[PDB]
Amino acid sequence: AVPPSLRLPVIEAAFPRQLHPYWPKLQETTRTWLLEKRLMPADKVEEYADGLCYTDLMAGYYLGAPDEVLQAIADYSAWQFVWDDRHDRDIVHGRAGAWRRLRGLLHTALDSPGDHLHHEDTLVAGFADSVRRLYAFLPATWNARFARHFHTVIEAYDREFHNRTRGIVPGVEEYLELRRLTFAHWIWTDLLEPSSGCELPDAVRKHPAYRRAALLSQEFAAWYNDLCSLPKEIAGDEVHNLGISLITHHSLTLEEAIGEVRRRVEECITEFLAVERDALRFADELADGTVRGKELSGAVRANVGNMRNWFSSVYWFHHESGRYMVDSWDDRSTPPYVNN
Numbered sequence: 001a002v003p004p005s006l007r008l009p010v011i012e013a014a015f016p017r018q019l020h021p022y023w024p025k026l027q028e029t030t031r032t033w034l035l036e037k038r039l040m041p042a043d044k045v046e047e048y049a050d051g052l053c054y055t056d057l058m059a060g061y062y063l064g065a066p067d068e069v070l071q072a073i074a075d076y077s078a079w080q081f082v083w084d085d086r087h088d089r090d091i092v093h094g095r096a097g098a099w100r101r102l103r104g105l106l107h108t109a110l111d112s113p114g115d116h117l118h119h120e121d122t123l124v125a126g127f128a129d130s131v132r133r134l135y136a137f138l139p140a141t142w143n144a145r146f147a148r149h150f151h152t153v154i155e156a157y158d159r160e161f162h163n164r165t166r167g168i169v170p171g172v173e174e175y176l177e178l179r180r181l182t183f184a185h186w187i188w189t190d191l192l193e194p195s196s197g198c199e200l201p202d203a204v205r206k207h208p209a210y211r212r213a214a215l216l217s218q219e220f221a222a223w224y225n226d227l228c229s230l231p232k233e234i235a236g237d238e239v240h241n242l243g244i245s246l247i248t249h250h251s252l253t254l255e256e257a258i259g260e261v262r263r264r265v266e267e268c269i270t271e272f273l274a275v276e277r278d279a280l281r282f283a284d285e286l287a288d289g290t291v292r293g294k295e296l297s298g299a300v301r302a303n304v305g306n307m308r309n310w311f312s313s314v315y316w317f318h319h320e321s322g323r324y325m326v327d328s329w330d331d332r333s334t335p336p337y338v339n340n
């Protein structure tokens with residue numbers, strides 16, 4: 001029973017959910033990892049980890065992934081949720097020095113994860129373990145591209161720190177550009193390739209149909225998170241949300257901003273349906289009779305299928321996850337799963 005303001009009949013009808021067969025083992029292995037890496041207090045892992053649905057999100061997205069690949073992705077994605085919470089708490093508590101240090105340590109650990117596996121900051125050590133694991137699947141050129149993308153993500157989070165401490169709400173286009181980075185669009189897109197077992201050549205992954213399909217998948221997911229997480233974010237003085245930027249800079253009411261964000265999300269869906277046809281036709285064109293053409297064809301088809309799966313996984317995640325259930329909290333500004 002999705003709230004009417006969030007319900008998207010086209011997702012529910014035309015994007016049937018998928019679940020990776022490794023999901024039951026993934027759930028418990030990631031929860032054990034969060035425990036053993038001390039990424040969340042033991043009592044909060046026990047009360048909340050499963051209800052957060054982080055592994056469910058990844059297992060509905062990277063279909064076809066080798067189990068070991070999906071495990072590293074899920075650990076890394078759970079880490080990224082804990083990092084979002086740490087960033088939030090550093091801003092709320094004014095810990096600009098602790099944030100600047102963490103920011104520098106994540107840049108360094110991203111380039112040399114092996115050196116940071118036992119770092120005193122458990123958030124850095126957990127980061128390093130998952131990244132080292134992700135670096136073991138594909139050639140070093142893929143690792144370099146992952147790192148280049150995530151160094152950009154870290155700096156976008158630094159920009160968020162400064163906006164929120166100065167109480168600056170970005171403008172709408174400013175925000176849309178920043179959101180492609182704080183949502184980690186290009187990391188999810190990069191992770192498609194170890195999930196289908198193939199580093200794609202630049203010529204294939206920069207093909208306009210592949211690029212546009214990948215963009216729209218992520219714009220849908222980021223803006224649907226904005227639509228669904230707007231209440232928790234207003235309650236916690238978050239400023240980064242397309243709806244907040246519309247209410248703040250365009251005098252829209254809550255109702256009007258929500259309607260506009262919905263319309264933008266819906267347009268992502270139908271633009272995706274159009275370019276999906278071209279991206280799958282390109283996957284067909286890559287199968288040229290050769291072994292290599294078959295490899296690339298199958299990899300592009302799997303990645304475009306997972307671009308599609310991201311729509312339904314993100315849609316349902318926001319209605320199942322404890323992360324967004326702000327009406328259940330005694331303190332609406334402090335989620336119970338965050339370390340305060």
Ligand SMILES: CC[N+](CC)(CC)Cc1ccccc1
Pocket residue numbers: 080081083084182183184221225314317
């Ligand atoms: C807070 C988690 N995340 C991961 C990119 C930022 C670290 C955004 C996100 C939210 C909801 C669904 C998917 C991703």
Ligand SMILES: [Mg+2]
Pocket residue numbers: 084
């Ligand atoms: Mg957040």
Ligand SMILES: [Mg+2]
Pocket residue numbers: 084182
């Ligand atoms: Mg955030």
Ligand SMILES: [Mg+2]
Pocket residue numbers: 225226229230233
């Ligand atoms: Mg959000």
